[PDB]
């Protein structure tokens, strides 16, 4: 994970991961439903934002050019990281 200092404890991290999504090793995005809107910035320009829709049971998907790949996973609970695992502090 990234340093959790100066982060709100209820932000559901995975967005604070130390991993760049590749085709062979994507970032798994948890979801409470079969589809979920996320937002990816442009790696060469922070001011540019692209919103996309991930679907369950689909191949890895890239949103911006030279950006990460993402896979949705349907879960019952999403870890509200800031008190879920840094309280575990394993």
């Amino acid at each position: 994970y990234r340093p959790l200092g100066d982060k709100e404890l209820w932000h559901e991290a995975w967005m604070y991961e130390d991993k760049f999504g590749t085709e062979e090793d994507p970032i798994i995005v948890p979801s409470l439903e079969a589809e979920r809107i996320i937002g990816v910035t442009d790696p060469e320009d922070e001011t540019l934002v692209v919103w996309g829709i991930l679907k369950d049971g689909e191949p890895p998907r890239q949103f911006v050019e030279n950006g990460e790949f993402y896979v949705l996973k349907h879960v019952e609970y999403i870890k509200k990281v800031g008190d879920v695992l840094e309280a575990i502090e394993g």
């Binding site: 709100e8 932000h11 967005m15 996320i38 937002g39 922070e46 829709i53 950006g67 990460e68």
Partner: protein
Amino acid sequence: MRWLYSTSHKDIGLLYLVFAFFGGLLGTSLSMLIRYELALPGRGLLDGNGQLYNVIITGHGIIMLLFMVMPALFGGFGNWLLPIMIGAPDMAFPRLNNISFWLNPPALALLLLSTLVEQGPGTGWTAYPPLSVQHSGTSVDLAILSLHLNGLSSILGAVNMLVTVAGLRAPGMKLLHMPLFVWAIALTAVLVILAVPVLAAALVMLLTDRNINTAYFCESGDLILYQHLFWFFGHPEVYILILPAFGIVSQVVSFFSQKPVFGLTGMICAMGAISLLGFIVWAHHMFTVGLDLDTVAYFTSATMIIAVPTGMKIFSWMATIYSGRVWFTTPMWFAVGFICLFTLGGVTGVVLANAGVDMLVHDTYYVVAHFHYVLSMGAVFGIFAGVYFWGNLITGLGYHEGRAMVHFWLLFIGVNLTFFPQHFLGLAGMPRRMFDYADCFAGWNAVSSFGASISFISVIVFATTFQEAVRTVPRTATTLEWVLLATPAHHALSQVPVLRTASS
């Protein structure tokens, strides 16, 4: 029940838009009487009743300033679009958002009811004393109470907007990733909170002069103090009504050019500089009241500095269209028409800002032409640009493209041939708020009255544009309202979307 007890921002925004359309119909109807009386020298359909003409222009100016443009831009598009755009699941105070709407039909009813009482409130939309004090009866009190209720509506809406922006943003989204529409609405809310209570104080002073025999603006008081307080409100008021139009033009221009906005931080600094300079130049409405020459000197030198940020915004819009892949539809034309015709209204403001030149054209139809350029080409074009752009997302109905271009061209022909001859009338010396003029002013008044009929016919054709919509599935977008279905669900953003920064 649904439309009476609602707590959803999307129902409240649609109610604001329908209310603003009703107010626009009322002000269109009140404006055909103005142009039908002024078509020919002498006495027209008003039978020489000057008090009724003053009532008509007062009600028409107040309605079009406060019950059409603000409920369409600030209340209609802002409430529907802000939580979807920043990713908030709802507003910060959902029931305050319903009383921010429901104080507007009482204010409209009071204003329309003041016309049927006594001889009506013929004072102008500015309502200067001692003419407003001299009016005997009930009509002026109903008009000022209507303004009080509308100001309370605006203050409550601005509080809800400012708390919704600061505290319900999506995770990971800072004050760099919000669209320029959000920045415009936030700056408009700040202006409303800083400006409306000064008007409320001046109106309380007006009621105490009228009904309590107090000494605010009277024999022993000072009548220039009213103009100070009212225009300290009123010059922020005209920038309240044009900033959401700037936001809508930015969103429309960036969409069909297939490009992001040129100079985002410059755009935000320009909107902030416009918001800050609007509070120190109010006395350019008071060059002819007898102020000292140093005060007039300052208010002349500080008014023209507003040209620089607006020019930066216009040039950045042109740079956004520049080097893009442009597709011209009906909202794209209303934005191009905005940028072309707001520039014409802005340059006459620089002329009016110079005080020596303003001694010749004060209270003439030159001023009328200036502010109908910056309001019928600036705010009305911005409103109609958003109606065709977001309409299938908001209402669930599409629009016929050919009839919308017919409506755009009828409107564009009508309002240009209405207010462009009024420049020549105001330069020659035709004064404001008069229903009869000298014999030589007949030609341009006939031309302007011909143009107003084309504008009315354009208003008629707009009701025929609506048709059934086609629905598809979204995948990606650059803003959050275009990855949603048309129409969205009652709880749009069923899961809160987050913004992830790319890793190393």
